[PDB]
Design a protein around this ligand. Structure first.
Ligand code: MG
Ligand code: MG
Ligand code: MG
Ligand code: MG
Ligand code: MG
Ligand code: MG
Ligand code: MG
Ligand code: MG
Ligand code: MG
Ligand code: MG
Ligand code: MG
Ligand code: MG
Ligand code: MG
Ligand code: MG
Ligand code: MG
Ligand code: MG
Ligand code: MG
Ligand code: MG
Ligand code: MG
Ligand code: MG
Ligand code: MG
Ligand code: MG
Ligand code: MG
Ligand code: MG
Ligand code: MG
Ligand code: MG
Lengths: 187, 258, 144, 123
RNA sequence: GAAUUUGGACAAACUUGGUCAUUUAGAGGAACUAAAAGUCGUAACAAGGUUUCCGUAGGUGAACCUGCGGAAGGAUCAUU
RNA sequence: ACCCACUCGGCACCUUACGAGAAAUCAAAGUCUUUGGGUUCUGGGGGGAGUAUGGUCGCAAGGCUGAAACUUAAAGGAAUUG
RNA sequence: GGACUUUUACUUUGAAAAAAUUAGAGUGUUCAAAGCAGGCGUAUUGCUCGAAUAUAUUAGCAUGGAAUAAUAGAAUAGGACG
RNA sequence: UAUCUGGUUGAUCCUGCCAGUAGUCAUAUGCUUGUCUCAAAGAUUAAGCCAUGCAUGUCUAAGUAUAAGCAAUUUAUACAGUGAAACUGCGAAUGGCUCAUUAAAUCAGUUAUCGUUUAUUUGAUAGUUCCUUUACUACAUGGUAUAACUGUGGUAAUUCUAGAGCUAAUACAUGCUUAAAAUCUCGACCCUUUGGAAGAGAUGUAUUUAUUAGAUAAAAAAUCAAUGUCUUCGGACUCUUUGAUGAUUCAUAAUAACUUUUCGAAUCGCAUGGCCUUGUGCUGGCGAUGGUUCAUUCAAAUUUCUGCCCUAUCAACUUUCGAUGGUAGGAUAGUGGCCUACCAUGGUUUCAACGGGUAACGGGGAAUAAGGGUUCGAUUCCGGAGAGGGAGCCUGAGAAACGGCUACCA
């Protein structure tokens, strides 16, 4: 099948090699997952020395992490909006590592209300003292704040769906978000 | 290729087993164990050729299945079980205990030891790391893992092993002046009173080694086994005491007694 | 040199697992990670205060220097972050009791922490396979 | 399979087959010492060459060289034990030119004739 | 959960053209060979009876012949 | 412009061999079994044969490059006596 | 641990260059090719020496020398000590 | 063991070459042949094709036996003696054979994995899991099928199998039971403002993601932000805690989560002992097998530097569609143009690229050698490749396996 050897294509001098040591198993390869959205269907694939791998297809949700507050939530994945490797991945909504995606962002909104409770966009005594102690944290960043009102946050898939079977990422923030924003608006 | 090999041809075994090149196509392949393949006694060689207790390979097998031979306090009833440097080969019957020590020529010699001190072994620590749940441990030259060691124990040291429990009784730091043993290299089988070592950052730390007769020589760090302080050792040295007596005076010495 | 307009790639370039928290504010707005390669090799000040990424940099990257150390003469700077050095040597032919001039070209990765031009003498350090043909990384420049 | 069995040749024929100065000398050695072939003389001269080769390689080395003395003593003793070399000539310089029939006369062929009880080498 | 089936990668095998070594063809054409006695002349070896030879060109049954330029391996180390 | 002595460079000649060579001869063809100053090119029995073949240059004549199969103890460099 | 560090070729010494094979130490195959055995006692209980050593170009590593042969620096001084 | 001799002439000074001479783990052949030891042997041409018969199976005290098998019971009315068959577990990836392919390829010496997998050995190493976890519950141990077997058949034929009926597991598939202590979260309420609470949940390991610690060449002061364990709230201020490498984002630990959810023993043989509130009550040894992770060992994969025969009647090659590098991603057990998208135009070469030939597997080595060398190495050891030619793949730790399977070609 697919091989990862180098006995094929030419050496640095440009010389064509002879066919020696026909394909061995330890140097095989497999097809991509090409993971789509919705109707979770994950197949397990056996690998060298056992240690079977997860080949995710059609994944529904994923564990997304907010680095600023150090929290992670399992949220629905909306779609793919930008991909450095290939634009066709975006049109087919295929999820790979380092893919810019949109998430529903609902669990963060409830968490933010449950943790600071000030507002997004725009009772007991235990409640305010925790919120009062957790002060100077409701002014995180303007651009990400406007995304919550839309109900669609921005994230980057930091996991490998074809390898581990999980689609996990983090919410874009800081100045890397601005880099992705300008490319999206460049149309 | 295509998988691990399960045979060891003759003329391919380590030369220190002293197996005759004729009389058989194959030599005993050591099993996987606490020691490497080339640095291995294995018992069928030791119980048949060294001690002459057994003549054939079948009656080598019979001895072990009666649970007579035990290695390091464990029976280890394996025909080709790998025995390595200073593994206490003890026999409950015949009330004899053997320790594996290199002779002057680098071969394994029979070293009968008293029962009182045949209940421990020295181990050269290879690596010191942290286990799971933050539990430090050390690995000796025979693969043993000992948890919660002394913090001052570092790499290249030698540790005495209780040989009844996994805990340690004593250790020796790897410093200049300590009594050392040559395990491997060209000078294999010598005791050499370490003097100085050269750092050689990047690889292959070296060390200078001086014999009791002031005969100095150099060997890699991987081949030196510290076995105590200068003078009194922690183990009973075999005959010869690791002097590398020259061939010219070897005939003179053997001519004295004839 | 010229900092090569670091953010002209189609993807965002950053040192992995190096977080610059927007919540707090301090000097050196972007945190930079660097390491000393060892073997008596000093990390140039260009890497400490630079803005490049160079995943394969020996000072600010995920590669490590280990193995053979070689010295060579630069003959090519045309590629991007890759140079070719020339390693001249004499091969002995015992029959004629005398020698033979020979050379070997070595493709080697070069970090933006070094500015190399053709004719320089640089020493290189072995690393894991970087490309189809590159297995070395420039660690010191000893010419001009 | 098993290790090969080591075997070696123990004689060498002369380069010139028909030379009268050597042809009659060969019949001389085989004459009064009862030998059935020239290979007996050919055999003896083979390690006679080997002995000289070892001795020549020893004299090239420097004096007091441990290798010169060690195999020098072994070679000088081993021929003295056989008796082809007299005790007086123990200098490693008289072994080079010992003789061609010195080895041959030490054979059991001659000893039975030397020490009576045979009254002829052919008997 | 079998048959069956969509798309894909690996890709045997086959057809069509380009490029890589050994064998048919002698109906043929023009070189060496081997040679106890062939034929025609007599080209070279002596000033070989026109010195020889080289290059180039032309001619001729065959060696060869001629022009031009060159050489001495010539038959001249030499005409104050 | 001649004469004498000397000198630097050059075309040559005369004598001799301590030297070389296979001799003929050679102040270079010497300083080479006492075998090494630097460097370029060419040769490996005589023929087949500067032929065959493939390139390449030329308008052409041909030049440059350049084998094999096969054949076989048989012409001189040099001197000597007739 | 600290900042500097002119780079080479060359040569000494040391570690590594599997076993068998090569040279070679000792030794009963009756000699020898071989083989690594064996030898020694009151032979009733048993004791013990061996199964060496050398060679192994080139490349890599460590190390001393620094003659020989290269290499770089201070010349419209942006040179050194400070 | 640094040696030569014959052959051009009437006679000669002389690399010629021819011939002679010696050796060959260099073959073949001819003639001849008494003994002892030792021993290569369908390599060369055809990695051409093969009848036939063999060359991989395997069990203990310790996985499963109602043989409608064999003997004796009297230790047993459930079983435990032997044991065909079959299920299960390992093995069959070793060995052995050959040298076709292969010319920076293999291979040799020498490096790295801080760039990976590793069945088997060996040492360590799971108190945490009844899930709305106060009746959901068997935890003195729970569910199903099925082989072997009985019976009914199909064909000329295969180590072909169908239908009907049982029965087991270390088969398959579920599944709980063992202390605490401590820390975090939420949080009733008194209500203080200096603030404390009842109560609930989580905190093993395995996967994935994000963040944090993993420091350390020297010594003293200024106050601002609030005191910060204890206060004479003046502030004494220390104890605070950190391993390894030449080098790390290393080991390890901490937080938030995630997982279609891994492991955390429903297994087997022998001995049967102590304690009482004498109940088939509670404790209790020697083992075997299995199991997550770590280390070890047997390995594997990739990889550093240098080194290979002959040819220019091969001088330029590579990049159409990968050729060289960058970024990102997929894939792999992993690095890597290994593959994909985009980008740049690179990379090798008279120090002989690229191409072509090899009656080329490479080495350890063999023959002959004064010294330098020449020729050979299919072949007893090491590494590589192959099972008629290619390709593809299941199982398994390990095969692109061929005495394993599928397809095409012959
Ligand atoms: Mg074995
Ligand atoms: Mg005529
Ligand atoms: Mg006539
Ligand atoms: Mg004439
Ligand atoms: Mg003139
Ligand atoms: Mg010739
Ligand atoms: Mg010729
Ligand atoms: Mg003749
Ligand atoms: Mg003449
Ligand atoms: Mg050097
Ligand atoms: Mg000669
Ligand atoms: Mg003549
Ligand atoms: Mg004649
Ligand atoms: Mg000649
Ligand atoms: Mg001849
Ligand atoms: Mg095999
Ligand atoms: Mg062949
Ligand atoms: Mg274990
Ligand atoms: Mg990549
Ligand atoms: Mg790339
Ligand atoms: Mg071949
Ligand atoms: Mg082999
Ligand atoms: Mg194969
Ligand atoms: Mg066949
Ligand atoms: Mg196959
Ligand atoms: Mg077969």
């Amino acid at each position: 099948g697919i091989s990862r050897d180098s006995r094929h294509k030419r050496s640095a001098t440009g010389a064509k090699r002879a066919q020696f040591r026909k394909k061995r198993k330890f140097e095989l390869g497999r097809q991509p997952a090409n993971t789509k959205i919705g109707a979770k269907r994950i197949h397990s694939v056996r690998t060298r020395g056992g240690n079977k791998k997860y080949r995710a297809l059609r994944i529904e949700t994923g564990n997304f992490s907010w680095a600023s507050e150090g929290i992670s939530k399992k949220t629905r994945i909306a779609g793919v909006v930008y991909h450095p490797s290939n634009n066709e991945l975006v049109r087919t909504n295929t999820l790979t590592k380092a893919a810019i995606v949109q998430i529903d962002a609902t669990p963060f909104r409830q968490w933010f209300e449950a943790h600071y409770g000030q507002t997004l966009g725009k009772k007991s005594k235990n409640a305010e003292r925790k919120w009062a102690a957790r002060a100077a944290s409701a002014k995180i960043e303007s651009s990400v704040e406007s995304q919550f009102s839309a109900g669609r946050l921005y994230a980057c898939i930091s996991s490998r769906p074809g390898q581990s079977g999980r689609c996990d990422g983090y919410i874009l923030e800081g100045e890397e978000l601005a880099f992705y924003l300008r490319r999206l608006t460049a149309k | 290729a295509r998988g691990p090999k399960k045979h060891l041809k003759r003329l391919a075994a380590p030369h220190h087993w002293l197996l005759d090149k004729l009389s058989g196509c194959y030599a005993p392949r050591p099993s996987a164990g606490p020691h490497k393949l080339r640095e291995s006694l294995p018992l069928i060689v030791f119980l048949r050729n060294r001690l002459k207790y057994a003549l054939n390979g079948r009656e080598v097998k019979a001895i072990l299945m009666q649970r007579h031979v035990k290695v390091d306090g464990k029976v280890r009833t394996d025909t080709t079980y790998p025995a390595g440097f200073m593994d206490v080969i003890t026999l409950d019957a015949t009330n004899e205990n053997f320790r594996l020590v290199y002779d002057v020529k680098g071969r394994f010699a029979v070293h009968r030891i008293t029962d009182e001190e045949a209940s421990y072994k020295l181990g050269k620590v290879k690596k010191v790391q942290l286990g799971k749940k933050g539990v430090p441990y050390v690995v000796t030259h025979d693969g043993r893992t000992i948890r919660y060691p002394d913090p001052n124990i570092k790499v290249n040291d030698t540790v005495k092993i209780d040989l009844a429990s996994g805990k340690i009784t004593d250790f020796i730091k790897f410093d200049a002046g300590k009594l050392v043993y040559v395990t491997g290299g060209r000078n294999l089988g010598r005791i050499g009173t370490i003097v100085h070592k050269e750092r050689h950052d990047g690889g292959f730390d070296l060390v200078h080694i001086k014999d009791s007769l002031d005969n100095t020589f150099v060997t890699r760090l991987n081949n030196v086994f510290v076995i105590g302080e200068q003078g009194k050792p922690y183990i009973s040295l075999p005959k010869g005491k690791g002097i590398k007596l020259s061939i010219a005076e070897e005939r003179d010495r053997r001519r004295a007694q004839q | 040199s010229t900092e090569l307009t670091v953010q002209s790639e189609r993807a965002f370039q950053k040192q992995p697992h190096i977080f610059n928290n927007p919540k707090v504010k301090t000097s050196k707005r972007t945190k930079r990670w660097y390491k000393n390669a060892g073997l008596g090799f000093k990390t140039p000040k260009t890497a400490i205060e630079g803005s490049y990424i160079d995943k394969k940099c020996p000072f600010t990257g995920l590669v490590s220097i280990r193995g053979k150390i070689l010295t060579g003469t630069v003959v090519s700077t045309k590629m991007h972050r890759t140079i070719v050095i020339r390693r001249a040597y004499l091969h002995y032919i015992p029959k004629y009791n005398r020698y033979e001039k020979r050379h070997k070209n070595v493709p080697v990765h070069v970090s933006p922490a070094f500015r190399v031009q053709v004719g320089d003498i640089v020493t290189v350090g072995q690393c894991r396979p970087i490309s189809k043909t590159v297995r070395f990384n420039v660690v010191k420049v000893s010419a001009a | 399979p098993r290790a090969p069995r080591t075997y070696s040749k123990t004689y060498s024929t002369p380069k010139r087959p028909y030379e009268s100065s050597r042809l009659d000398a060969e019949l001389k050695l085989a004459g009064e010492f009862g030998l059935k072939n020239k290979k007996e003389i050919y055999r003896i001269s083979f390690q006679l060459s080997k002995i000289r080769r070892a001795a020549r390689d020893l004299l090239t080395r420097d004096e007091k060289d441990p290798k010169r003395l060690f195999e020098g003593n072994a070679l000088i003793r081993r021929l003295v034990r056989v008796g082809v070399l007299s005790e007086d000539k123990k200098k490693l310089d008289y072994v080079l030119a010992l003789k061609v029939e010195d080895f041959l006369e030490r054979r059991l062929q001659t000893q039975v004739y030397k020490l009576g009880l045979a009254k002829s080498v052919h008997h």
